[PDB]
């Protein structure tokens, strides 16, 4: 139970330091912090009392952590325009323009036909999805409608 105490802050500051990072738009979501770390404390308690080492539990707590927050749309938009719009865009505007994108209409329609799970990066899609993100922020460019400041 101090070990509880422990272990809850500890995949609380994991989960909030991952969404920070890969999912900044989810970052002040409580709920879903508080769930989500609630959820790694039981299977690392379960873990613990079924035999597994404190690592072991550790390891799939995290798991748990984590589960289907894999793939992000943020990543993925922040990586199209280091890649391909380097020259038009440079830093800092990858961090600054990706969760613009990320609320604009034509972005998310693109998003929304593909199945986003945790092994979709490694996907035949992935390719498919980047290569249709590319050519809409082209086209959103081209257009001058690029969501700006």
């Known amino acids: 139970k101090s070990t509880e105490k422990k272990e809850l802050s ?3 500051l994991k989960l909030e330091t991952y969404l920070n990072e890969h999912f900044p738009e989810m970052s002040g979501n409580n709920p879903f912090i508080t769930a989500r770390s609630d959820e790694a404390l039981t299977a690392y308690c379960d873990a613990v009392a079924q035999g597994f080492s404190h690592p072991e539990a550790e ?3 995290s798991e748990v952590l984590y589960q289907g927050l894999h793939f ?7 990586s199209v325009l280091e890649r ?8 800092p505007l990858p961090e600054r323009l990706a969760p613009i994108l990320l609320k604009n209409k034509a972005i998310q329609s693109v998003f929304a036909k593909y199945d986003l799970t945790d092994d979709f990066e490694a996907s035949p899609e992935y390719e498919h999805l980047y290569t249709e993100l590319t050519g809409t922020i082209v086209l959103l460019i081209e257009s001058n409608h690029l969501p700006t400041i």
């Open 10 to 12: 500890h995949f609380r």
């Open 59 to 61: 390891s799939m707590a």
């Open 72 to 78: 992000s749309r943020y990543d993925t938009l922040v």
């Open 84 to 91: 391909e719009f380097e020259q038009e865009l440079p830093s």
